[PDB]
Amino acid sequence: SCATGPRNCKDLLDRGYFLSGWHTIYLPDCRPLTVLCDMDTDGGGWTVFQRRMDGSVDFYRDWAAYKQGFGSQLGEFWLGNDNIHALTAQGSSELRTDLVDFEGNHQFAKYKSFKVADEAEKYKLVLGAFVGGSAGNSLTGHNNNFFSTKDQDNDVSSSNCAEKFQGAWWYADCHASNLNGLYLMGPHESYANGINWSAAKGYKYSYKVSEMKVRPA
Ligand SMILES: CC(=O)N[C@H]1[C@H]([C@H](O)C(O)CO)O[C@](O)(C(=O)O)C[C@@H]1O
Numbered sequence: 001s002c003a004t005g006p007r008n009c010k011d012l013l014d015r016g017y018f019l020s021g022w023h024t025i026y027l028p029d030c031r032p033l034t035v036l037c038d039m040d041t042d043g044g045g046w047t048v049f050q051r052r053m054d055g056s057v058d059f060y061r062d063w064a065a066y067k068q069g070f071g072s073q074l075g076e077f078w079l080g081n082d083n084i085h086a087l088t089a090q091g092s093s094e095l096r097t098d099l100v101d102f103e104g105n106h107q108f109a110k111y112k113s114f115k116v117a118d119e120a121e122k123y124k125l126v127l128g129a130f131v132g133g134s135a136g137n138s139l140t141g142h143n144n145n146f147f148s149t150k151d152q153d154n155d156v157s158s159s160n161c162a163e164k165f166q167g168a169w170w171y172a173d174c175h176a177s178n179l180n181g182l183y184l185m186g187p188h189e190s191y192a193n194g195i196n197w198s199a200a201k202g203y204k205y206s207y208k209v210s211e212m213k214v215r216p217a
C-alpha cells in the first residue's frame with residue numbers, strides 16, 4: 001500500500017522506528033525505494049542521500065553513475081539523482097550537512113529548504129535560506145546551478161569544473177563546496193579537489209565524514 005506507506009524517514013520516525021538504518025519508502029510515483037534514515041542526529045527523521053566516511057568508494061564517477069546511484073548500504077554512497085529528485089519534489093524539505101574532520105570535530109550546516117529538479121533540468125539545485133551551523137555556508141553559492149559530472153558539463157565555467165576538482169556537484173565557476181571530491185584524508189596540497197567545505201576548513205582540507213540528508217520542514 002503506497003498511500004498508507006511511509007513517504008520519507010520522518011514518517012518512519014513518527015511510527016516508532018528510533019534507530020538509524022535502511023528502510024523502504026514510497027516515492028511520489030509509488031515506486032518503493034530503500035533509503036538510509038538518520039534517526040539520531042538533531043531529532044532524527046532525516047533521509048540520507050550522500051555519505052562518505054573512509055574513502056573505500058570511488059566518487060569520481062560519470063553522469064550515469066550519479067543518475068542511478070552507487071556505493072554500499074554498509075558504507076559510502078550516493079543515493080542517485082533520479083532518487084533525490086523524487087524525494088524532494090513533495091512538500092518542503094530541510095537540508096542538513098554533517099561534517100567530521102580527522103581531529104574528531106563535528107561541524108554542520110542547515111538550510112531551510114532543498115530541492116533538486118528532474119533530469120530535463122539537469123538536477124538543478126533549488127536551495128532555501130541558510131539557517132546556521134558551525135560549518136558555515138558553502139552551498140548558497142551553488143543555488144540554481146545544474147548538476148555536472150566529468151562527462152557532462154553543465155556548470156557556468158568555460159572550464160570543466162568536475163574534471164578540475166575531481167568530483168561531481170552543482171558546480172558554478174567552480175565551487176565553495178565539493179563533498180563528492182577526492183577522499184584526501186585531511187590536509188592536502190592540491191587545490192580544492194578534496195571533500196571541501198570552504199566556509200569551515202577551506203580548500204585544502206578534506207573531511208573524514210560527509211553526510212547530506214533531508215527532512216520535511
Ligand atoms: C574552487 C574554486 O572554484 N575556486 C575559485 C573561487 C570560487 O569560485 C569561490 O570562492 C566561490 O565562493 O573563486 C575565485 O577565488 C575567484 O574567482 O575569485 C577563484 C577560484 O579559482
Ligand SMILES: [Ca+2]
Nearest residue numbers: 153157158159
Ligand atoms: Ca563548463
